[PDB]
Design a protein around this ligand. Structure first.
Ligand code: HEM
Ligand SMILES: CCCCCCCC(=O)O
Length: 390
């Protein structure tokens, strides 16, 4: 499956799979088997299915049995909510929801607008401006730094560490995790003494069962960094890619820019910046679309395929149409693990798109759509470059 044609445009393959092979077993780059689930109905149900596990210990045990080696238990910093099942997940999630509120995101928007305006100042000076390099790549970790409460004095080191929290180019996951942990532990202690208007402070001073331990707050911060950096980059890039490859619709959006909050969901659905969700492990035998998948197997659920499924969106699902009724989509997941950062991701996309279209009303792609490229993806997916003419 994982061919170059799939990498660049998976939608024809997803159409074949949804029709002919809605559960298809593949081998992943690590040598383990995975089962790719492509129909919207099955992706949604699987995300709601208590028989599927996100527990990292269970997943590594299954991976180790398939590859024949026992994998060592992972560090407790990895036991955050995205790597947990209930009841552990329920407690960690409840504390995070208490602090990471829609109101907190709304309150971050003034500074986010100011950050975007500064990034566009730098973009306006480039000889060959690129919306990925100049906007979609830098914005997410700036937003996460603001959300957490990282001081500007520590900015450059935080950015360096965050480039590992996705081992990425260096493989320094252990070293950077240790260093970032020591830094974030000191920041958590600083917010205990000197609380400020940020998420770490809100979690440190939470009451009752909403209060996690300092180590759990540290692990939560790691989940937010890994969960919201490359994903948001892909979402912002994908939304711009959708507009820029459909200039007639970009023109209409520019002419009626107040519609933007009611159009972003279609940009997200169409661009589908989440190719797969996090892996799921079967805790017991499960039947999906006529196929029995035994206990102990790994599922790969595709929001991108679900978002383009005509069973869920009968009218031209493989086309972008900003005028269609606001669609529901699976890009943020579904069920108990539904993206905690969805309002913050939306805000970054809305602010970025609005300010680009306002400041650069003639913005257009500098290449033909056929020249865009993607790299192989196991989670988030978007073009590797978005060169524009301003
Ligand atoms: C600053 C922005 C973001 C932050 C802080 C963030 C953080 C998180 C966290 C902590 C979780 C785990 C929730 C849980 O397990 O209960 C999560 C789930 C998820 N996030 Fe986000 N996220 C952000 C943006 C995004 C974006 C832009 C996308 C899509 C392109 C995305 C897609 C998802 C999905 C699909 C899930 C569910 C995963 C699954 O069920 O397998 N997130 N997010
Ligand atoms: C494998 C652990 C991932 C930590 C948070 C990721 C959330 C997401 O799927 O974007």
């Amino acid at each position: 499956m994982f061919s170059d044609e799939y990498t660049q445009n998976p939608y024809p393959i997803f159409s074949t799979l949804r029709s002919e092979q809605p559960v298809t077993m593949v081998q992943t780059p690590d040598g383990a088997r995975a089962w790719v689930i492509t129909r919207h109905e099955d992706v949604r149900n699987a995300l709601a299915d208590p028989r599927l596990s996100r527990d990292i210990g269970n997943l590594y045990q299954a991976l180790g049995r398939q590859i024949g080696k026992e994998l060592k238990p992972t560090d407790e910093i990895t036991h955050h909510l995205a790597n947990s099942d209930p009841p552990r997940h329920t407690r960690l999630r409840k504390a995070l929801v208490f602090a990471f509120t829609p109101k907190r995101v709304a309150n971050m928007r003034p500074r986010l607008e100011q950050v975007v305006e500064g990034l566009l100042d730098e973009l306006a000076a480039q000889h060959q401006p690129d919306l990925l390099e100049g906007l979609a790549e830098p914005l997410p970790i700036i937003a996460i730094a603001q959300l957490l409460g990282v001081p500007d004095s520590d900015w450059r080191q935080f950015k360096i560490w965050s480039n590992t929290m996705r081992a990425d180019p260096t493989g320094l996951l252990a070293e950077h995790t240790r260093e970032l942990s020591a830094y974030m532990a000191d920041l958590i202690a600083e917010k205990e003494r000197h609380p400020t208007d940020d998420l770490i402070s809100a979690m440190v001073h939470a009451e009752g069962d909403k209060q996690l331990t300092p180590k759990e707050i540290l692990s939560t911060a790691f989940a937010l960094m890994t969960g919201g950096n490359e994903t948001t980059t892909a979402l912002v890039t994908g939304c711009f890619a959708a507009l820029l490859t459909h200039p007639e619709q970009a023109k209409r959006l520019k002419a009626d820019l107040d519609r933007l909050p009611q159009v972003v969901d279609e940009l997200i659905r169409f661009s589908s910046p989440m190719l797969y969700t996090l892996q799921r492990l079967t805790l017991e035998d499960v039947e999906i679309a006529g196929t029995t998948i035994p206990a102990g197997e790994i599922l790969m659920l595709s929001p991108a395929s679900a978002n383009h499924d005509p069973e869920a969106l009968p009218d031209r699902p493989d086309e972008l149409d900003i005028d269609r009724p606001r669609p529901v989509h699976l890009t943020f997941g579904h069920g108990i693990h539904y993206c905690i950062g969805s309002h913050l991701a939306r805000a970054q996309a809305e602010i970025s798109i609005r300010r680009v279209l306002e400041r650069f009303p003639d913005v257009r792609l500098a290449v033909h759509p056929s020249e865009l490229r993607y790299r192989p993806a196991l989670l988030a997916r978007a073009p590797v470059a978005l060169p524009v003419r301003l």
